[PDB]
Design a protein around this ligand. Structure first.
Ligand code: 67B
Ligand code: CA
Length: 139
């Protein structure tokens, strides 16, 4: 909710919508799998992920780092490797989603490096204030 977290999330959301979702034939990854359409999916995938869920997470500011966002991006790929196989066209398409994620992030490397540091400085200051305000039981 701070300016820096809002700017960080703004970059992640644009990478998802403008770049990752534009990969050709990426539609299997745009939304959660519906068991009515893929009956055995959740018998095999125990940690499902998709781009819409990532966008809901970005909206809630779940990610304060590239690494945490990229953990969920990578889950999409890993799940396709498990469910479809490493050589499936599903998995080739997932791989391209991940590649264009990494490539687009690199175009923002300096600014995202700074934003991650500034988010973490502000979180730490706010944590230390909240700890001190509780510890004195006066107010
Ligand atoms: C809401 N929609 C569009 C679906 O539930 C839907 C429909 C048709 C296919 C898929 C599908 C998705 N993903 C991620 C796969 O790895 C996969 N492997 C075989 C089919 C699929 C999902
Ligand atoms: Ca107090």
């Amino acid at each position: 909710d701070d300016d820096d977290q809002v700017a960080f999330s703004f970059i992640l959301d644009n990478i998802v919508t403008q770049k990752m979702m534009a990969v050709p034939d990426s539609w299997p990854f745009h939304h959660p799998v519906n068991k009515k359409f893929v009956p055995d999916y959740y018998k095999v995938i125990v940690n499902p992920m998709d781009l819409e869920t990532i966008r809901k997470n970005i909206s809630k500011h779940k990610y304060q780092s590239r690494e945490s966002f990229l953990d969920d991006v990578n889950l999409i790929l890993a799940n396709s490797v498990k469910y479809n196989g490493p050589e499936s066209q599903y998995t080739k398409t997932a791989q391209e989603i991940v590649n264009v994620c990494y490539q687009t992030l690199t175009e923002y490397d300096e600014h995202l490096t700074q934003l991650e540091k500034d988010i973490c400085t502000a979180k730490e200051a706010a944590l230390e204030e909240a700890e001190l305000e509780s510890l004195d039981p006066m107010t």
